[PDB]
Symmetry: C6
Subunit: 205 residues, 6 copies
Amino acid sequence: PIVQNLQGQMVHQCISPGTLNAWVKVVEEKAFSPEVIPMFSALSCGATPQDLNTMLNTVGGHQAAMQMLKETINEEAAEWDRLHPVHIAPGQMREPRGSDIAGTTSTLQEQIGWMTHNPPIPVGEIYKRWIILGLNKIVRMYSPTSILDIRQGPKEPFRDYVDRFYKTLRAEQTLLVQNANPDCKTILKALGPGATLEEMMTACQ
Amino acid sequence: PIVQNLQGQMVHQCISPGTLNAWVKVVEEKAFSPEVIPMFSALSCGATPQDLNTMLNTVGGHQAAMQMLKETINEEAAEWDRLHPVHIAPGQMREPRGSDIAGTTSTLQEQIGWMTHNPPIPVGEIYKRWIILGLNKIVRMYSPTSILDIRQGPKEPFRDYVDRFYKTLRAEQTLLVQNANPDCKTILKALGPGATLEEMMTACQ
Amino acid sequence: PIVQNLQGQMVHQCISPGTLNAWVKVVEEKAFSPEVIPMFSALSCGATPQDLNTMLNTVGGHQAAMQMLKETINEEAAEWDRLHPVHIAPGQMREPRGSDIAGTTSTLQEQIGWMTHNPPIPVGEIYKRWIILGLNKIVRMYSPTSILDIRQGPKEPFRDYVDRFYKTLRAEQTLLVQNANPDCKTILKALGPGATLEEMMTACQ
Amino acid sequence: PIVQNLQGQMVHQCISPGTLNAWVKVVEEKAFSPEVIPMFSALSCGATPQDLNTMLNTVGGHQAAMQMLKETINEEAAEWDRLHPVHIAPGQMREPRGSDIAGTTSTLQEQIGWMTHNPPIPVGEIYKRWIILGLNKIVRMYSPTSILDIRQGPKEPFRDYVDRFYKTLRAEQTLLVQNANPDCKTILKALGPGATLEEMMTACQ
Amino acid sequence: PIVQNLQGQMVHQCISPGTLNAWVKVVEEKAFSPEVIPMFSALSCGATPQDLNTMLNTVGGHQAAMQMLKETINEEAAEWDRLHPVHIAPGQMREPRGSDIAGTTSTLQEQIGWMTHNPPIPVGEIYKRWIILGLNKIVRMYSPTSILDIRQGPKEPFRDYVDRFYKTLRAEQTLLVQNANPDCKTILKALGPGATLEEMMTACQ
Amino acid sequence: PIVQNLQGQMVHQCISPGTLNAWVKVVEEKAFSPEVIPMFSALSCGATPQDLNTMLNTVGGHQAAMQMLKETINEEAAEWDRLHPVHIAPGQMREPRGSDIAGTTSTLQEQIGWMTHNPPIPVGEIYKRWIILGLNKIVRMYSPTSILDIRQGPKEPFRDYVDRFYKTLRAEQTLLVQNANPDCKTILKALGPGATLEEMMTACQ
């Protein structure tokens, strides 16, 4: 990544073993559960495009997912090129293309130069945006259950049903009452409109 | 977070893999046991609103809880807006709204600017306050037992009963004597008023 | 805690995940075995009162113990107030009360100001003293066995008996010979007065 | 490796226990699965040739592979010598040969001198290139299955088949439709040309 | 401990969780096997007397041993007082007694002052010497087997016998040939005088 | 070890718990497998002779090996004394003997002085050389199998046989074809002279 040193200047730092292992392990343990994406963003704090490719490329499984991610990246790269066309002068900074932002046709030194320029061109942040767009698509696709099929069981605790409900909703990206069981539904209808989730959970506890 | 460098200046630092893993693991292991909240506050020392959202968003389970937390946050944000209304000048610092403090409509750079200003606007501390208010509500709700049902068993050691008692009281947020068993109750009544917990525990040991 | 930076100045540092986890785990593994207290003191090196409360508050179990600790703290705080009464001037440092030293009614900024003043008011050290006083009381109370009941078994190795003996003595806070078994007692009496523990252990080996 | 200190200057740093252990463990766990190579490159960020040899030499197993890697290295070293022949002056920097880049006939001090010169001679980067060329050959050789034999099972989920497909393709370094099972093949043919992988996976889900 | 900062000055640093845990765990795993002592010395690199007491005091088991260690320390402290008697001036450095070196009657600040003085009084090093003297006595005492009873079994590999031999010798602090079995003894006698251990091991392999 | 600080100056740093544990664990897990030696060299990067003795002395097992290592060290020390004889002036640096390089008769301060002098006397590097010479002798001795007895099994995969072959060769410090099984031998003879290992492995796959 690029970080501020002890004296304030922006400089490159190697991606740590800790960071590398943390990402690989969370993918192994959580697959494409929605919470993996906030973890990805935090672990890639200050990342260059090289760092972002490292993280994605260190993943061993899920190659269907990783190929879909490349497609999304290539769509975002193409749209960047459509909005930001480029036409170099000796010792001067060239303008980044889509593939340069994706770390494919740019060197680490060039990425550092764009990221630390004044004004800066935040190629790590632009690429992470594209990557997260792609990851969100995968999270949605690999969501195993529709929200329409999350219904409260006859003796399922309401808290457990609401957990299942908002877990599914998060992945998929009124109905809570409708999908409740008969006993809690009668209690929830009695509360009337504008009841908070807290109030609903308290009532069916 | 925002920390002081080796030369004393306030600068941003990436949230660590250690911090990220520590929070996720304590939620997995302890759920909403009351001691999780002091752990949350300590792990979020110097945190930006972005950092606070990272920590909450990396939690995979308990989505009923996390949705309740959003409601509480939105109530606190709204009250902030009622007390601190806002009406920008080129290159000048805008005033934060509720949603800016919650990290929803503010950038990392803006959060850094408020937090490091002179005088500072401590948006990380204000948001953590709101989050802990919400977490305390959840801890209370998910408390499994009323203090009225913590009673000493016939041959339960007094120490074990007092542990259960103050564990429950902590979550729920004279009676100790009343809920004691007959043998220890007779001993505790004999001590008279103003006895310390130490004195009570010594007597029923 | 408060530490010296690379250039020598006293500044605040966030309590680490390593420190937080180390304390919680030693309490879980050792409860109130006497060696926990030296571990507590070392893990709280340079700690503010806020840091000390964090450590105590992150403990999930043993709430009977933690309530007794609060009583002890409140007794020490009251005695501080009796010896150090307080009667503020704009932008000037106020005098700490008992509750300020215990971190209850003082901010982190105030604690930093007292701790880094010239001359300093070491509120972290004063509070740790009170906490350790309270912990020692608990260690003594939760000591399972009187030293009078640590007696050497008929075929118990002397080394194993002496370990049990000084383990118990440590928790409770001539007799070694008296509580020895007949065979070793005869050997130990033959050594005469002024024999070292080493000499005693060698003789009964 | 060679890193920038707090004040910006390029200096040598010892390879860490963390880095050493991370590499050895990933080889033990993943052998020559293709994702090991991006891990190797990241763990060797800023590495000297000495560091690169350390990493390779700490591997205990797979000596057939490591001997093949030496052959590849020696081929690249020889080609370097063919393009960059060398003909020293007291206290002056000599030109590196193939074996100097491979860390065989060069000292650490010489490697540091080439790497930190102005203009620099990036001997760590040149050698890592050679090593990765050799590793890619091994990954291909140790690929257990041809892409021609990755066919969808009668009731294998399409996602699981695509994972197997792109896993194999990655190691080996239209057909996806042809190797699909009859049911999904009929669905995929109906989509027509130019369908994305996402569209294909959605259709056969 | 006391370490050099980034700018070269000698300053106090808190004992780390890593150091604290490493010592406690090696005692738990190895007891008083002789290799524990080099580990103790290395883990206490730069230690103050306070740090040394922390390490010893964090040990939960082996209180017979720890009481013997106190006796040894008190003997060394007394001898220090006999050689270095002491007779203070406002704001001036007092001379250390035995108990000050052992960290019993000295503050951390005083220990820092002696250790960082010019010329320095290395109270951490003097105390570690006393502690290691005491630990060596315990290692010898807790050695389970005399070297006279380490004899090669009829079909015990010579390497395994020599390991047992020098393991025992290390703890206890010509005979190798005499204690060998008949077959290897005949081979070893044939080598004649002045044979190396390597030569002996090669011959009986 | 001795490292460069943030400002470039050569200063002593304590050996880390991480380094100490890493060495002890690799010896426990790998014994004297040949890959332990590159691990030793890397873990002892920048080591003083004191550090090197620490690492060797923290090893609990294998005392036959460690005694052989002392013999080798003493032979190298004696040869140093034969080539570098020594004949001190107040406040001046004395010349190191063999035993000073081995850390036996030299202080840490003296080792630091030699290592950081201009010109430096690299006593850590000279001693590590001697130690590795000794370790290589042990690796060879403890090699369980001659290369002459590594022969391919009737249905052993060629890759598995080549792994065994170069594993043994590494420890021991044309034949590959001769020791192959009849089926692969016929294939390998057909390739003719000058075939690479890659080509051989491909052919017998």
